[PDB]
Design a protein around this ligand. Structure first.
Ligand code: CQQ
Length: 350
């Protein structure tokens, strides 16, 4: 501990470089302790994340290696970037902790989502989401678990995605707590395509309008009921694309016509008494009717969503058509000891 010092932050021991001062707690759970700090060397505020038990198991180590490699290789304004990475331990043998240093954002989408919406801020947040998701897809990264807690925003309304989800897997399976934003093809295990992340964007948008989670529930069974009660029972063609065992339960459910999108998202939930606000309520509802579609064969793509009148007002080829990032590796299994060495070399060679 020459260039390092210790400090207790939010019931967690932070052994960080002497350049990071005035550490303040900001977040924790379901895996990872985060705090805010001032970088003396850069004269800027940062966010420092201490990884929670990265070598407890192979899933933690695979997810830690994946996140560290992707945060380094990706360089997009709508995806959180890695400013610095360090370990207070001097050797591979002693190595046990990883500290990721990133730009400090003002709030999480979980609180911004609760704000009284204006079409300007709302369309801008969704535009940035679609931009970041487009950039991940270009590199073959299908998130599959996009949620408000995985997204951070700044005072100027600029947005960044924190996570990469299941990333480069193949796929549609997570074993760990918030499943309200997962696409039906993921829930029912049908296989996914790139527009699987569009359902999650639809869920988040619907929530910005309603100020209530669209599809809540104790479990998937309860969650699927909330989907069919509101959007209606899917077409026989979709239920045909299900394998016989889950198909049996889905087809045995009571048939629902589903509430129309005017009834799901009435004008009451939208800014009123202006011609511009009237126009914008129907455009927002129309985009929801294209994103919140059970059948992924009929759901809108990221590219077409960016082309929608509600979003296209922000379209900038410099932000949207940016070059995809290129590249042990990201679908091969290793022992926990082997992930530790892969993780140690990433922290050291940066
Ligand atoms: C909503 C999730 C929920 O329960 N509510 C919630 C609120 C806040 C946070 C949180 O800690 N995020 C947060 C809060 C305050 C400032 C910042 N700024 C920031 N800047 C850069 C990086 C980070 C960061 C990185 C890694 C992990 N966490 C934060 N933060 C951020 C969490 C949860 C549930 N929905 C999923 C419905």
């Amino acid at each position: 501990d020459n260039q390092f010092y210790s400090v207790e932050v939010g019931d967690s021991t932070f052994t960080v470089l002497k350049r990071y001062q005035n550490l303040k707690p900001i977040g924790s759970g379901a895996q990872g302790i985060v705090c805010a700090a001032y970088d003396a060397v850069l004269d800027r505020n940062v966010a420092i994340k201490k990884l929670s038990r990265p070598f407890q198991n192979q899933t933690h180590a695979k997810r830690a290696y994946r996140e560290l490699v992707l945060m380094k290789c990706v360089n997009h304004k709508n995806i959180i970037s890695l400013l610095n990475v360090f370990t207070p331990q001097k050797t591979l043998e002693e190595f046990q902790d990883v500290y990721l240093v990133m730009e400090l954002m003002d709030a999480n989408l979980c609180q911004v989502i609760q704000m009284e919406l204006d079409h300007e801020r709302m369309s801008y947040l969704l535009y940035q989401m679609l931009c970041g998701i487009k950039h991940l897809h270009s590199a073959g990264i299908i998130h599959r678990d996009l949620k408000p807690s995985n997204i951070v925003v700044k005072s100027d309304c600029t947005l960044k995605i924190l996570d990469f989800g299941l990333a480069r897997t193949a796929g549609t399976s997570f074993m760990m707590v918030t499943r309200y934003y997962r696409a039906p093809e993921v829930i029912l295990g049908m296989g996914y395509k790139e527009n699987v992340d569009i359902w999650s964007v639809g869920c988040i948008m619907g929530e910005m309008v309603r100020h209530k989670i669209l599809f809540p529930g104790r479990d998937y069974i309860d969650q699927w009921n909330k989907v069919i009660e509101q959007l209606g029972t899917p077409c026989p063609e979709f239920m045909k694309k299900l394998q016989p065992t889950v198909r049996n339960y889905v087809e045995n459910r009571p048939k629902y016509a589903g509430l129309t999108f005017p009834k799901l998202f009435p004008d009451s939930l939208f800014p009123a008494d202006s011609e511009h606000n009237k126009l914008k309520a129907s455009q927002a509802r129309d985009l929801l009717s294209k994103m919140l579609v059970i059948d992924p064969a009929k759901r809108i793509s990221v590219d077409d969503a960016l082309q929608h009148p509600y979003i296209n007002v922000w379209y900038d080829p410099a932000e949207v058509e940016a070059p995809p990032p290129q590249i042990q590796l990201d679908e091969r299994e290793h022992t926990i000891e082997e992930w530790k060495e892969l993780i140690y070399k990433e922290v050291m060679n940066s």
